[PDB]
Design a protein around this ligand. Structure first.
Ligand SMILES: Nc1ncnc2c1ncn2[C@H]1C[C@H](O)[C@@H](COP(=O)(O)OP(=O)(O)OP(=O)(O)O)O1
Ligand SMILES: Nc1ncnc2c1ncn2[C@H]1C[C@H](O)[C@@H](COP(=O)(O)OP(=O)(O)OP(=O)(O)O)O1
Ligand SMILES: Nc1ncnc2c1ncn2[C@H]1C[C@H](O)[C@@H](COP(=O)(O)OP(=O)(O)OP(=O)(O)O)O1
Ligand SMILES: Nc1ncnc2c1ncn2[C@H]1C[C@H](O)[C@@H](COP(=O)(O)OP(=O)(O)OP(=O)(O)O)O1
Ligand SMILES: [Mg+2]
Ligand SMILES: [Mg+2]
Ligand code: NA
Ligand code: NA
Ligand code: NA
Lengths: 481, 480, 481, 481
């Protein structure tokens, strides 16, 4: 009927427009209550039980805050109530496409299960949004509140995934370009999605968040840069932006790429792979889908959530025994053992095509220690992690426009040397974790010897614990001594 | 083997003894990751996604804090490392018995589904603890860390459920105070409450007024009637009254939220309609229903909030009735709130009369033009007992205190000795009425029946009475 | 000029209109940086170092929030930018009149020092506001931003102190009545001043605040009640309002009336009394004022802050030796010793005129025990504390109007039985603390005997520690056994 | 033995040993209630009203936490109750020496006022501690609780200031070396003083703190490194340590070196300099001291707090008119105007002795543009700020010892390459702020031209707003285009 107030622990009392309420009260959206924001992280950080549902409300709310604040400071932008609603909707709905365990699904599982396809949760969101609209008679309700469904549905989808291919967008013209920089910012990565998860994940994880989004909003203006209207930050605030990405990096290093969290994700992925053939999910017209193919039909995908984990865990079907056994090993905490961590040196970069060949390389190393057990390629997992500021090797701050107190409509650029000598020199790196599937004390000892040898052989960094875990191997490498 | 560190958002970095790690890393305990602390509340408070698992770690940690602090202030108590471990274990394990959606399971579902049994999550915890111990070879590991399994397993169980003349056999009278930590039957002041106040507030987005750390610093053990009891400092009496006021606030704002409760009611109804067709494998391959898994711990292990999604995602036409109710939850087609009232004077509605109340509302005769006529089954009447944890009694009368000038001398404090601004009564009842018929005309009619029923039973005027039923409220002179 | 942004720990980033900046950047306002919010409380709660300055910004900000939210929900109220500014100004400025150590000055010191006058910090605020306006050329600046100084200065003053004398206000007409319910609510005590201090004092004290003002604002509406437009709360929210006053009461019982905090306030007051003759403060035209008379000249009052404490403490003048000695006893923590606490029973009420006669009564009690020392009236302090819900014996919730979801413009009333049986029966009480100026073990023992006897004699409540501190006295009273 | 409980907003309920209570309840310690932690910062961050008093309790408490935790994990260290008390006392007392406005006094005022002396607040603390002990009969009370005053007073002083000149300490032997790494860590800068201020300043400022000290403590162990027992961190925690110093840097950049906060500190310092001749503070035997000389007599220093600001501000003495006028300009917010900010490039490092010559350099620049006014050296302030990780150009993490999960008693080292490529390359930098004493629009315009020219001339970084504030000057420098 009218506006709903929702009490969120992060944002406090949030107003929801009745149109958003209608979008929210659908199985496509409610689905998000059953997908953990951080997947395997919950198995390391016991506070991190939060789901995509609450994150989505926060992204929607923040999207609305930014656009509304821009509108109030700059009425010359001609931001309408219609524009605000579409930005809120895009904010709510950009998480619709997440599969079970969020980033494990599109980052680990689908690449292994369906190598030939290229899938992202963003594509999923678009498809799921379409399904949500059509299955719930949303278009009449959009019209009722002054939206024009054809243009606006397009606008929403473009905000989530980018150009559906000179001005490449068809939902809004160039004079509203800045509206595409709110929910998902392809230019520099500063968007409201990040802002909600920094705050939300920190609150649940028990880490403290150093970024203040409210301050960013108060200092945000729209200015012309190269004949486009873009969201600009106040020049003074440049330090806070570098801090925002440092914060992003901290969350990744401490929580999202936690070495045990990642191994749990790997084990859950492995169980899904072994379960994939025997789990069936009913989609459109009674047709059946696998976990790995539910991404092709939105009706099936609706019913694809973290419940899959428990479906496997509680199953009696002997065909699911292999999948079920892996998950039971998670419950007993018989996890694959962390062997160590290393990095490439200088400009050495490990390509995506070489990932499969790395367990073989570790097993082929010839450490000079007496070993009771001999280990093979399949006993090792090598997890290559790309740690960056969101834009590969590029500095995202070079893609931010700024303004000064004295000329608020004049956009400017700020280079890294203009800010601080204490900032990072590089903006992308790689971490290599090694784990061993053999969990006894003797195998783990052996694994450590192979690993440290492989590091020496590839001229990678000395593992931090190198002298402790492999005292007979580390002296051969002069660079480490 | 040394300590594992867990980072909890409420308590920060918590150390876990390797024995507790072993108890935690079992399917019986890990199960608790899949049971929401506040069940249906998550459908009202979007922050309230937290599970019993994390609550359990917190209860364990706090239990350890209290016993350890008592030990350090009073070494004459002779609290051993053994005693601390058993109190921590009891703290961890007192939530083992919770079913799907926590309090809805033992408070709504089992009473309706299995009226002949008397079941509490506490009994469940004892049974589940036994199963956890036996299924995971914990006894050898208890011995390894200096526990004596026979005495100590008993001690742990007694802390969770109470006594199975000094009624306890896990510890003697000289250690009586150890039974006042995890679950305090005497006055309700225990560590389980302290963790949930803090945890639920952090997730719900309300702020918690109670400071447990301050209570611990002012806690002492003193002799009262030949028993050693945990006493509070006399000055702190105001904070204790505040602690129960806080408990009451959490209940009124969150745990008994009118929509949260209706969602709990709907989920319970779906479980009832699903109970015949969901099967859970227990011991030796035997099959159990949702309502009977409480009789076999192996089945109960696999009984979590996943039941909700099992029903919701099912295709079996036998589950259509249950599935339809849950789909109505997703679409937010909920039973509509009609209004709320209370009994007056000493009037107390007994548990046996709950069933007869929808009939009473439908039988009321409001003197107005009604487009629809409504029947008993169209109404839900939810009776809620709001109290300070001890029925009509004041829990502060069951707290012993001490003074700065005589720290070993226990005393009592009466309510007039504290404040005239305190509550006169310590128990009350709320009656919510809802309508299963959701259209505008039915809701209008429902409100007329309801306000009439209030007048007829001499209950309190509903707050919105003049707005929802302007033609009914003038008949009652006491209301104006 | 545009807005200045202030980062407050309680409210986050606050915007200040350039007019408010001008009012703030004056010695009359800046003065408030040197007056502690909680006076003597800082000597008990080490976090409570905050000053009236920051509290004032918060009251101003919140005043603006409430009026602005009302305006946005109900444009039919015709709240202008002019109205918002005046409410913000009244919010900023309602603390201008506070003397050194806030409530101790108007609550303890002036009543003792100048019994014939009736002074309140609110009157002080009006006078100080007038002085601020005139001394800083504010009127031209008010005109610049669309205010009409004659009407508006009046409006501001009326918000702070009430009618300067049928509609009794002359700053605004009946159709804007609700604007008088924001900064200082004479009707029920629900105002923004309280809201800032609950939040601010809790944050500094290390108590946690259970009241959510943001939620109140979202549920606040203006409705007609008895031909007046009043701020109404949503019916559901009634529980939270009772809780708001319970919270107020908790803050008083734990912090503002802490037994040691109050004795420190008593000692500081006593030092000020002994110093009052010899401290001189320059006012208008070089004229000299005492601490107790600076309230008569705003120029002197400007220079009257917590610095008075340190002026006395650091003085060398032998005439200030008496005052200086008391303050040195505070530093050494040689405080008057707490003897005990009691309350009147039934309808017994101790009147303000009888406070002086109470130490005599305690000393005149006849305990019938062996006493090494005999104590006199001047050895005892009796502190009478009025604890209420803000409106004497009355329930403030009976003076709150409500509305329902189904009829948002229709005001209603809610009686106490309509809410809960667990609520307080009485809404005012008195606490009596007794202290002894003699600090040795024997005097303290004797003092406790006199005190417990006096309780018995006056038929007051049994002191909590009665059986411990006076085991020979408590058995005579059958009501206590 | 009764412990006293203090409720701190940061740490919650803190127990104080009766000996610490005795040290606290003295004028030498209580003095700290009247010195603001962040001096001038309060004039920018209105929450930052907190004083050194509360900070000191926190440092004491944390010192006790660390030593106590080390004792419980490693009883082989033989940490006694005596050792814990001395570490707590050192923690309490390391802030005793702070003057009015904390770091402004030792960082700005004394260097200008007394160039011939080398004074630090740490030396002040030692002297003040000595005075506190002797003036309050603390030595007998130390003996009562098992301390041996001669050895232990030495130990406490050494913890605060370092060696009072092969093992350089005489309070404790090499086997207790780690006890010197708690209150003030000269080796790497990881100490409990930092931990309390990160938490405390953030809580008051309204910034959020990303460092978790409790986690550091749980991962801290004592291990042998080069025949010394040192506090070691877990190898995994190395990232958190880099983050700790990044956090320190953030606090400095956002708050402690805020451009307005620093100008207020400069103005207060200037007023103190002009007041120094005419303010008298009574010390030992009735002798009189100036603000700049009270550091030579502890009895005078006791009475030297932020009250000096208000003494000057409220004075009528015409000799204080110059000092009083500057402070009145603070109240009216007629502050020296920020012109801009720059940094040195390459290896250029501006020495402390050259600070005085910089305003001359700026005024001597020849921008050659239409200028209504000509500005002189005395019209400019140049503030040089050293931003570092606590150890000049060195990486503090190279001076941290670590241990591994697999060998907890074996200390190791970790190089920067072994951690992350995303870390800083340099660990020290300089910021140069320029301000103008002339506040009109025309002078400010001129000042900006001189400034940007001076940047070009010295080959410093382009000011961020350079193209806006000086569009005719920035094109001459090719490196900036
Ligand atoms: N007292 C409270 N304090 C904090 N949050 C609350 C409180 N009551 C409810 N909430 C939460 C639960 C929801 O997230 C949100 C709205 O709940 P509430 O205002 O009770 O809505 P409702 O939908 O039951 O009221 P309405 O009767 O207007 O429909 O705030
Ligand atoms: N940097 C961090 N800050 C806060 N919490 C963290 C951080 N890293 C991990 N945690 C959380 C996750 C866990 O609940 C808890 C323990 O994690 P961590 O110390 O990484 O254990 P671990 O078992 O992986 O390490 P170990 O190698 O010592 O076994 O702390
Ligand atoms: N990085 C930060 N994070 C949080 N609060 C900050 C930060 N920097 C400054 N503050 C606080 C201090 C002030 O109270 C408020 C505004 O400061 P700031 O924006 O630096 O104002 P200013 O007047 O110095 O800037 P300008 O006039 O250049 O816009 O924010
Ligand atoms: N209810 C409360 N909650 C939180 N902090 C409190 C409360 N009451 C007092 N405090 C604070 C103020 C002090 O910092 C600290 C100690 O207070 P309190 O225990 O009242 O000391 P006290 O010394 O007056 O008691 P006594 O001498 O009677 O033991 O805690
Ligand atoms: Mg581990
Ligand atoms: Mg400014
Ligand atoms: Na362990
Ligand atoms: Na309980
Ligand atoms: Na009252």
């Amino acid at each position: 009927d009218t506006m709903k107030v929702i009490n969120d622990p992060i944002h406090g009392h949030i107003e929801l427009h009745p149109l958003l309420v209608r979008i929210i009260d659908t199985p496509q959206f409610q689905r998000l209550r059953y997908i953990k924001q951080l997947g395997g992280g919950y198995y390391v950080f016991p506070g991190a039980s939060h789901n995509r549902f609450e994150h989505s409300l926060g992204v929607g709310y923040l999207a609305g805050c930014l656009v509304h604040a821009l509108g109030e400071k700059q009425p010359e932008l001609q931001i309408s109530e219609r524009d605000v609603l579409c930005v809120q909707i895009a904010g709510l709905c950009r998480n619709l496409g997440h599969g079970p365990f969020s980033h494990m699904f599109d980052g680990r599982f689908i690449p292994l299960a369906r190598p030939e396809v290229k899938w992202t949760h963003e594509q999923g969101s678009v498809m799921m949004f379409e399904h949500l609209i059509n299955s719930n008679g949303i278009k009449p309700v959009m019209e009722q509140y002054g939206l024009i469904p054809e243009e606006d549905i397009c606008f929403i989808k473009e905000q989530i995934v980018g150009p559906l291919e000179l001005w490449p967008y068809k939902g809004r013209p160039e004079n509203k370009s800045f509206l595409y920089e709110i929910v998902s910012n392809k230019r520099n990565g500063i968007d409201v999605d990040k802002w909600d998860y920094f705050a939300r994940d920190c609150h649940h994880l028990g880490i403290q968040n150093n970024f203040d989004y409210k301050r960013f909003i108060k200092f945000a203006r729209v200015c012309e840069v190269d004949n486009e209207l873009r969201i600009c930050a106040r020049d003074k605030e440049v330090g806070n932006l570098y801090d925002m990405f440092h914060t992003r990096n901290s969350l990744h290093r401490r929580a999202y790429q936690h070495k045990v969290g990642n191994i749990i994700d790997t084990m859950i992925t492995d169980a899904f792979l072994k379960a994939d053939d025997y789990i069936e999910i009913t989609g459109a017209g009674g047709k059946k889908y696998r976990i790995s193919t539910a991404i092709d039909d939105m009706e099936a995908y609706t019913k694809l959530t973290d419940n899959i984990f428990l479906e496997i865990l509680y199953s009696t079907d002997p065909k699911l025994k292999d999948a079920r056994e892996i998950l039971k090993q998670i419950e007993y905490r018989n996890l694959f053992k962390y062997v160590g961590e290393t990095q490439p040196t200088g400009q050495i970069k490990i390509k995506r095509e070489d990932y499969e060949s790395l367990p073989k390389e570790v097993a082929s190393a010839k450490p000079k220690v007496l070993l009771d057990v001999k280990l093979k390629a399949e006993d090792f997992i090598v997890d290559v992690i790309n740690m960056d500021y969101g834009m590969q090797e590029k500095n995202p701050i070079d893609h931010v426009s700024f303004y000064c107190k004295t000329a608020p409509n004049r956009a400017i650029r700020i280079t890294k040397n203009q800010v601080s000598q204490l900032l990072p020199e590089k903006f992308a790196e790689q971490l290599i974790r090694v784990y061993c599937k053999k969990v006894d004390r003797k195998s783990l000892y052996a694994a450590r010897q192979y690993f440290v040898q492989w590091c020496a052989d590839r001229n990678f960094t000395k593992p931090q614990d190198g002298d402790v875990i492999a005292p007979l191997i580390t002296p051969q490498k002069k660079e480490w001594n």
